[PDB]
Amino acid sequence: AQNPNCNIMIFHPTKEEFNDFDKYIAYMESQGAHRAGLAKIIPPKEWKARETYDNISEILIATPLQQVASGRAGVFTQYHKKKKAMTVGEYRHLANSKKYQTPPHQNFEDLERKYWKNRIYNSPIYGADISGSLFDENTKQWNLGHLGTIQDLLEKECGVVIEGVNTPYLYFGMWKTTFAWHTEDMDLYSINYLHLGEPKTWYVVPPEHGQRLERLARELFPGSSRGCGAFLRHKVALISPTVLKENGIPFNRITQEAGEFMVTFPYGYHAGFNHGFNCAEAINFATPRWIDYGKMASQCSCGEARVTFSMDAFVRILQPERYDLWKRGQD
Numbered sequence: 001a002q003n004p005n006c007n008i009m010i011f012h013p014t015k016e017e018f019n020d021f022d023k024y025i026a027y028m029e030s031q032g033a034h035r036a037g038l039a040k041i042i043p044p045k046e047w048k049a050r051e052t053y054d055n056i057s058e059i060l061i062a063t064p065l066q067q068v069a070s071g072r073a074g075v076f077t078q079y080h081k082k083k084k085a086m087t088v089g090e091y092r093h094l095a096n097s098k099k100y101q102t103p104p105h106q107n108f109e110d111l112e113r114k115y116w117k118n119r120i121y122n123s124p125i126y127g128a129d130i131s132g133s134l135f136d137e138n139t140k141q142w143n144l145g146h147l148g149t150i151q152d153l154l155e156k157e158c159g160v161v162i163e164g165v166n167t168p169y170l171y172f173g174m175w176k177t178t179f180a181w182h183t184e185d186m187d188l189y190s191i192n193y194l195h196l197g198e199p200k201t202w203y204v205v206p207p208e209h210g211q212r213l214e215r216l217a218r219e220l221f222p223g224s225s226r227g228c229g230a231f232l233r234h235k236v237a238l239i240s241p242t243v244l245k246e247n248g249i250p251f252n253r254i255t256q257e258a259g260e261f262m263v264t265f266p267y268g269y270h271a272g273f274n275h276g277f278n279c280a281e282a283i284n285f286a287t288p289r290w291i292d293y294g295k296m297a298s299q300c301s302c303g304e305a306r307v308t309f310s311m312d313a314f315v316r317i318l319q320p321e322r323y324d325l326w327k328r329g330q331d
């Protein structure tokens, strides 16, 4: 078995290997990458997402979210308070302000220590989940707006034609902005490209150990667990690496820099934080190997998780028994 310790693997494709996206994902899995839950792909030196980032300031962040924490430093939840709209240029200025800017630090490890020590005492503002793309239309390789759609994959694999669309989302981050422990909707893959700015640190649990994380989470968030049998679908809970180590949960960590792709694999729980002002783009995707994960994916039916239009068909076709209850949660 390749990669039996479930380490995060880093790949350096040539320009020739960068042509066929599906084929390269399948190559990475042949070397065991998926066992980690997360892989890093460094594009060939010849490649670029677009020519410059000089003209992005007038993109609108219609609903910036202030991420307010509750709990203790290593075990907390966050809720998202809606703020007034602002442009990317306004947001970048805010991120760089004395109130919100990255503190002085020695290296990424020192910054990670400071994040876990101090995150809960601040409420950073995140521009998340903004439909759109920063890839130039002329970028033909690994353009996250031109991937094969999940609906087309399901149709190719299973023969059923379904409604729905699949488009990318932009994320504008600042110091301490945080992504809570989660897997993707319907335990899909994700791909994330860091277009610009400061790094993003990731933590990930191997798919084969995801239920260990879930059991810890039920212990650590016992009221949330009673409220919903899939409450990590709410995307609000944080657990530090120190706490995961204390409880014997297998995980790994890596820092993504500007110009790098990350791929999350089906049922790979992940969480993380931004180091300073940055912009990422991400999208879900599927492969043939995903189908079995989609069929087994947990679902939130309590009403909190509320998701896209396009998840309807996935639940309806892959999880018909669950469909009725899940849809009640959506309505």
Ligand SMILES: O=C(O)CNC(=O)C(=O)O
Binding pocket: 171, 178, 179, 190, 191, 192, 200, 264, 270, 280, 282, 283
């Ligand atoms: O970058 C972020 O805030 C969150 N991204 C992801 O969870 C992802 O790409 O799967």
Ligand SMILES: [Mg+2]
Binding pocket: 055, 056, 057, 058, 059
């Ligand atoms: Mg603009």
Ligand code: NI
Binding pocket: 182, 183, 184, 190, 264, 270
């Ligand atoms: Ni994710």
Ligand SMILES: [Zn+2]
Binding pocket: 227, 228, 229, 230, 231, 233, 234, 300, 301, 302, 303, 304, 305
């Ligand atoms: Zn729920």
